């Protein structure tokens, strides 16, 4: 049954991810914080406002604000408020965020090497398409 | 969390699945038995051996044999060994199985109408393949 197998896959997938994130020592960075840290490190000539994080992660301001607040508490970023507009805040990688970023690139590189073996990109775009239309149908 | 979200979706899909199988009274047919019944009902001029079932459902003789024995226990088919060949066993849709067929057709129509809207069958076949190969890769 496809639904029973998918339920099984999800559980294996969460276990598989926790195990690698530990092996690569990016366990707390795995997930949205990693996605933010990555974008920062990949685009050094741009600035990231908290609103940049909302649009990339399609989350709300309250959710994004507590996310960047978490990343600052973890020593991953410096939050620097804009001097012109008091409501705009910028995100900057610390030294630890830079090291963690570059380690996170390596961890993802192996995941795309292992988990997506034998899966073309056209198969992936459609799979994401099917899952979204199932979700919309619910 | 994307994984938390996928788990919730699959749980919604299964709940909606049970809802339609109850509605159309086809709960045991969701899956291979329904596929066999359909092949029987749709092709009434051919005969289906157990070895035919292996090819149709891409299963083993042992898996097909336990499948049809389950379908007979549910009264969907009669398994009648060949009167010519002692090694061939044939499958025949019963009266109950013919009613289940048309009940199963409307059920599939409802799935394609509601939960599986906008998803072609080729899109489903790839989705199943990605799921099989991702599971293989975490091993």
Author numbering:
A (entry chain B): 3 to 140
B (entry chain A): 3 to 141
Quoted passage from the original study:
In the present study, we conducted structural and functional analyses of the heme-responsive sensor protein PefR (porphyrin-regulated efflux regulator) from the β-hemolytic bacterium Streptococcus agalactiae, which is the most common cause of life-threatening invasive bacterial infections (e.g., septicemia, pneumonia, and meningitis) during the neonatal period. Therefore, PefR promotes the expression of these heme efflux systems in S. agalactiae in response to the intracellular heme concentration, likely by binding heme. The monomer consists of six α-helices and two β-strands containing a winged helix-turn-helix (wHTH) motif. This architecture of PefR is similar to that of the multiple antibiotic resistance regulator (MarR) family of transcriptional regulators, in which helices α2–α4 and strands β1–β2 form the DNA-binding domains.
Recombinant PefR was purified in its apo form. Gel filtration analyses showed that apo-PefR eluted as a single peak with an estimated molecular mass of ~35 kDa, indicating that PefR (ca. 17 kDa in monomer) exists as a homodimer in solution. We observed structural distortions by the N-terminal His tag by comparing the X-ray crystal structures of apo-PefR with and without the N-terminal His tag.
